[PDB]
Amino acid sequence: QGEKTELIQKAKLAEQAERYDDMATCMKAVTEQGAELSNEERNLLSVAYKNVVGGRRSAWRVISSIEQKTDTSDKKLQLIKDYREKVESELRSICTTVLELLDKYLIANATNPESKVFYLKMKGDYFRYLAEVACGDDRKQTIDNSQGAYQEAFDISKKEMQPTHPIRLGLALNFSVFYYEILNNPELACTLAKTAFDEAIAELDTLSYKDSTLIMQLLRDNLTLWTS
């Protein structure tokens, strides 16, 4: 469409300028046209929201740490909490926006199994970011939602994609992070990452090799950290 080209061009401009809120608006607008995204469009959408939500996650982490070190009956503590809650509501709004696009357009209209794994993984990621800042019954539901998406993504990728495929490696990576930081199960996080590494290294010829290698390096970085 005459507009879809306009929107992607703005998206690529916004990306080079590091205006990720503009990038996300353009890519969200492309998605709601209804047509399946190309690999290029898919990556622009992922890069945009990764950066949009990433800025709030880092802000939340800074504020919560300050909060955890502040005294109880200290006057200045309520302001800290209120600021954390403001940042929290932005993060939730961003995550629910992404999850909406996934459920309404992206997962459903995926034809490749590779495309479907990409989006199911994205679904797991954004419920995981919600689970990072959830508590109570809220936390239990978001965790199960994140797990459900990762587990389905995991199964498809094990049946349809090769161990060296970057999307399968990247899903193993983020699924292991889920086990380590959300479920707090480090041994299972280690096995998930190690298994993916070992299966990929046994086929380094049947290999895009750069992105596989760099993801496998993140897998092993985590493993070294976790086993130490």
Partner: peptide, 8 residues
């Protein structure tokens, strides 16, 4: 720290 895909 622990790294996810965004570290790439």
């Amino acid at each position: 720290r622990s790294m996810s895909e965004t570290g790439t």
